Design a protein around this ligand. Structure first.
Ligand SMILES: CCC[C@H](CC)Oc1ccc(C(=O)OC)cc1NC(=O)c1nnn(-c2cc(OC)ccc2OC)c1C
Ligand SMILES: CCC[C@H](CC)Oc1ccc(C(=O)OC)cc1NC(=O)c1nnn(-c2cc(OC)ccc2OC)c1C
Lengths: 288, 286
């Protein structure tokens, strides 16, 4: 059903995903852990929305479990250094993912920086959804797991958070690996990211990935449960871009109050294009 | 009531306990934590499995770290909590050494008898202090910010003599004065290995036991507590048996997997009485 170029396009994306996604997080080490005016009132309401407990299962069978403090002053920033290290590690895998794709490495190094800069959060969330357990509200990251804390309204209150609603909605679609990796490609090759110069070239690339996704779905999903699935996916990607803008502003408000971002994260935000992104520029020039 | 010599005897023991028992464990810091020949090994596995506890660490901000031990998979995994317990035992024993140094009857003994008594009573006095922070309802030793909770495997727990001791002793609901008198009777044991002033230590132990017996007769409703003193003495006899069983237990583990601190090494037979106990000798002369 798929064309030969579309089959090869899916094969390269799937191969890149396998080579660059550490699903067991076995190489995630040396991370930080919680030790053994209205800007504050605005910041406090953001962190509590996505409260998680941290669990670490050792290779021997032991389990360390961290329950966060129940308050809202600097105790709300206890897990941010760890989540920053976790986010940075996921982003380095995202950078490697883009470097393996032939359509990406042929772009100018400044556009490669701009595309990764604008899609860092989005591709991280797409990979996070593949390890999200919707029944337990837990992201299962190999030895580490992040379990959402219960609340009064239960499922109702937590779903008001658009980031959590995105993960539950996307998980309900029961996407295949091929559909996830095509979403990552469509988000990565966004022609309207700030700083992009080859707008038309990136725009032509994005359209071919979307056409391939539509063709893949029509060849492998006949059930009425998957009606309009391609348009649902494209709608989810538009929603994810909106969530990216809102959560980037949350982080900068928190970085204002309590600095926590890693040097690579600081490059992604605001905290010569190659001069302001020395780490990303180096990682893009290195091999894999 | 008590005689004047017996009332002052209890006052000195309570004074020593107050000054040397960190009941909140506020000064227990910088301890190690679990990170993130087959015949001798076969016995060691059966040794550690009986007393498995989860470690809970409460932070000043309200957060809680909890450690669940791994199940026996046949390796060095069953040694995960030994560095931490070695640090806890070392900290408790330094408080036990300071407790004995406050007692006038103990300072008047030769330094070699002081070493032998503390060496033989180290485990016993530590368990006696541990029982005062043991919550029998939850099976947890509450050590300030630290908690050690017995892992569910109750009738089966009572097969282990160490756990049966803490449940039975806690059920007696002893006073602070009765606990510290138990510590004195255990500390002044004349039949410890290496003791030379047998007659002097025996007479001291008898005076403490008579003081405890007289304290119970005067401060508790008779005849309801008619046999409480004999129950306490029976608990002390069982504790001496548990001490010998777990000393041999530690030696077997230390042989295949060294974990004991330098002060612990002096407590057991790990390598003149003062020459083989230079740390203990130093802590006693300071
Ligand atoms: C494995 C966890 C999955 C779950 C999915 C929602 O995630 C969390 C759960 C809980 C918390 C939390 O309890 O907070 C203390 C925070 C996050 N999530 C980020 O911490 C985070 N996710 N993405 N990014 C990010 C990364 C960037 O490039 C490196 C750029 C911008 C970013 O965000 C604006 C961050 C900091
Ligand atoms: C802190 C909670 C109290 C609880 C009471 C049973 O304690 C444990 C809980 C759990 C374990 C455990 O899960 O095992 C890895 C082990 C012990 N208990 C000792 O670790 C231990 N208690 N006393 N001593 C010791 C000390 C000596 O000098 C003071 C001399 C000899 C000793 O033993 C032969 C040790 C090593």
């Amino acid at each position: 059903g798929l064309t030969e170029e579309q089959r090869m396009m899916i094969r390269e994306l799937m191969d890149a995903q396998m080579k660059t996604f550490d699903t067991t997080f076995s190489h995630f080490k040396n991370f930080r852990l919680p030790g053994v005016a209205a800007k504050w009132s605005q910041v406090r309401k953001d962190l509590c929305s996505l409260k998680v407990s941290l669990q670490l299962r050792g290779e021997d069978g032991s389990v360390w479990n961290y329950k966060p403090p129940a308050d809202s002053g600097k105790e709300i920033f206890s897990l941010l250094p760890h989540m920053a290290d976790m986010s940075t590690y996921m982003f380095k895998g995202i950078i490697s993912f883009a470097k393996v794709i032939s359509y990406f490495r042929d772009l100018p190094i400044e556009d490669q920086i701009s595309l990764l800069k604008g899609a860092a959060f989005e591709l991280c969330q797409l990979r996070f959804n593949t390890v999200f357990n919707a029944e337990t509200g837990t992201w299962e990251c190999g030895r580490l797991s992040y379990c959402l804390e219960d609340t009064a309204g239960g499922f109702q209150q937590l779903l008001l958070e658009p980031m959590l609603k995105f993960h539950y909605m996307l998980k309900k679609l029961q996407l295949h690996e091929e559909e996830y990796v095509l979403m990552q490609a469509i988000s990565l090759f966004s022609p309207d990211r700030p700083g992009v110069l080859q707008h038309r070239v990136v725009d032509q690339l994005q359209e071919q990935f979307a056409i391939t996704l539509k063709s893949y779905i029509e060849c492998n999903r006949p059930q009425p449960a998957h009606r309009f699935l391609f348009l649902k996916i494209m709608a989810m990607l538009t929603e994810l871009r909106s969530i990216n803008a809102q959560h980037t502003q949350r982080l900068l408000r928190i970085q204002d109050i309590h600095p926590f971002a890693t040097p690579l994260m600081q490059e992604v935000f605001g905290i010569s294009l190659t001069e302001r992104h020395k780490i990303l520029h180096r990682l893009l020039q290195e091999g894999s």
